């Protein structure tokens, strides 16, 4: 598995991960310590595969935003910085990394779409969306526009739909709530009617995609596109001389960028948590440290305060993180694809006049809701077969008898630990080759079972375990009615016994 004494780190080969390994060399001069430092391709693929082994990196670095659905994996182990700690970043990068309520990786580097202006079309850039109107007007009689930026993804247009009181998923009390989507409030209504009335006063074009935003700034055909870190490159190039701003605002509010957070996850299979603590708290983030990986390749802004404040002596960053201190942190939660995907079709729609906007936004609220929805409840019998399922290892493990029939090694060292795990099925979409699951039926009384089974190893037998819990009417939590252990080659023992 995961070598224990030294510290394996997986970070993206677009990352500063030359600059990463200097920090780990530092490590281990400064405690002995071995830090190995990899970029695999494809390793936000690789990392949920590997890690459910019980392999993979000691730490993982990837954007927040796959890491709630790590940590539903069981893959990301709660992170225990102190206050002291906490207070060296920026209050709003914590929550970002949350799951279940809970910390689960540290806060390294913010990005957000930022205004981005032709100084030599446009002097001073418009700090308000309904300015933009009466600036393209006059812009275009100088054969020019005012702004071109992508319409055909909604991760673009989100800053503006978003200002006046839209959101994804409603963020309350270190949790989302997955059921509480802001899609067709008034707040998005109005944005999306601004954007969908630039286009019908012929102030932008419900076509522009990436690809023509970028080649019409980059040519100076247009004084504003939105943007961000990842285009600067090109825009260099074009040698446009450009600046790097705060989006417009819209209704008096700022824009709304999606924010994502660049994060150090621990793997919950890693026997060097302490030392992966010791290297991000102390190494990894420090002016020192982030200093180092940022010569390599620029991380843009970040989350540490003592060196953010040392690197908006580049405007461009300093206008990224104030977007992305108003922004809407990018939600952790797998349902995010449905999210993607309805307000994909709402802006499309809406933007060539395929649907009213009220139309189309209703039907992304509905979309999302309905997904939302089934996710819930899987959630709940998931989390709920879980709780059986743990009620009964401790039954089983417990009894003399059993652990007998298991024939245990029960030795010098102490009680075998035995391992439980769910039957071994065909995997398909979610999958799960032995998921926790049970079948349920009513009784006369209408009364819900649950039906479970479940393997409990040794060393020397593998056995089932079928158990049967009928719900109360009530006080909590279902009663075992029905619960026996099948041990190979011997009789059948039961826990409990219908009768």
Not at 2 to 21: C, F, Q, S, T
Not at 340 to 347: D, F, G, I, N, P
Not at 409 to 434: C, F, M, Q, V
Not at 469 to 490: H, L, T
């Amino acid at each position: 598995k995961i070598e224990e004494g030294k510290l394996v780190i997986w970070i993206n080969g677009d990352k500063g991960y030359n600059g990463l390994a200097e920090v780990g060399k530092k490590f281990e001069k400064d405690t002995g310590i071995k830090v190995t430092v990899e970029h695999p391709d494809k390793l936000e693929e690789k990392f949920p595969q590997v890690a459910a082994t019980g392999d993979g990196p000691d730490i993982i670095f990837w954007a927040h935003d796959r890491f709630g659905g790590y940590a539903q994996s069981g893959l990301l182990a709660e992170i225990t910085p102190d206050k002291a700690f906490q207070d060296k970043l920026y209050p709003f990068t914590w929550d970002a990394v949350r799951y279940n309520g809970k910390l689960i990786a540290y806060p390294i580097a913010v990005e957000a779409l930022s205004l981005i202006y032709n100084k030599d079309l446009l002097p001073n850039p418009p700090k308000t969306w309904e300015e933009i109107p009466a600036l393209d007007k006059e812009l275009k009689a100088k054969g020019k526009s005012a702004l071109m930026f992508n319409l055909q993804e909604p991760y673009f247009t989100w800053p503006l739909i978003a200002a006046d009181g839209g959101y994804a998923f409603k963020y309350e009390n270190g949790k989302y709530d997955i059921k509480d989507v802001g899609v067709d409030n008034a707040g998005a209504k109005a944005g999306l009617t601004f954007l969908v009335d630039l286009i019908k006063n012929k102030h932008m074009n419900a076509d522009t995609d990436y690809s023509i935003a970028e080649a019409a700034f980059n040519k100076g055909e247009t004084a504003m596109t939105i943007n961000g870190p990842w285009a600067w490159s090109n825009i260099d190039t074009s040698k446009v001389n450009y600046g790097v701003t705060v989006l417009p605002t819209f209704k008096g509010q700022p824009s709304k960028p999606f924010v994502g957070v660049l994060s150090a996850g621990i793997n919950a299979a890693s026997p060097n948590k302490e030392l992966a603590k010791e290297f991000l708290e102390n190494y990894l983030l420090t002016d020192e440290g982030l200093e180092a990986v940022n010569k390599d390749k620029p991380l843009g802004a970040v989350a540490l305060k003592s060196y953010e404040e040392e690197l908006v002596k580049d405007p461009r960053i300093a206008a990224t993180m104030e977007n992305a201190q108003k922004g809407e942190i990018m939600p952790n939660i797998p349902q995010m694809s449905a999210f993607w995907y309805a307000v994909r079709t709402a802006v499309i729609n809406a933007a060539s006049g395929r649907q009213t906007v009220d139309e189309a936004l209703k039907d992304a609220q509905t979309r999302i809701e309905a997904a939302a929805k089934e996710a819930a409840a899987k959630e709940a019998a998931a989390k709920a077969d879980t709780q059986l399922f743990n009620r009964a290892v401790s039954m089983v493990e417990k009894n003399k008898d059993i652990r007998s029939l298991l024939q245990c090694d029960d030795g010098i060292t102490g009680k075998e630990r035995l391992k439980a795990y769910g039957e071994l099925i065909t995997n398909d979409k979610w999958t799960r080759n032995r998921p926790i699951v049970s079948t349920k039926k009513l009784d006369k009384e209408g009364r819900t079972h649950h039906y479970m089974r479940f393997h409990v190893e040794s060393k020397k037998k593998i056995a089932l375990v079928h158990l049967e819990a009928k719900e109360s009417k009530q006080n909590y939590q279902p009663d075992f009615i029905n619960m026996y252990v099948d041990v190979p080659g011997e009789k059948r023992y039961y826990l409990i016994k219908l009768e």
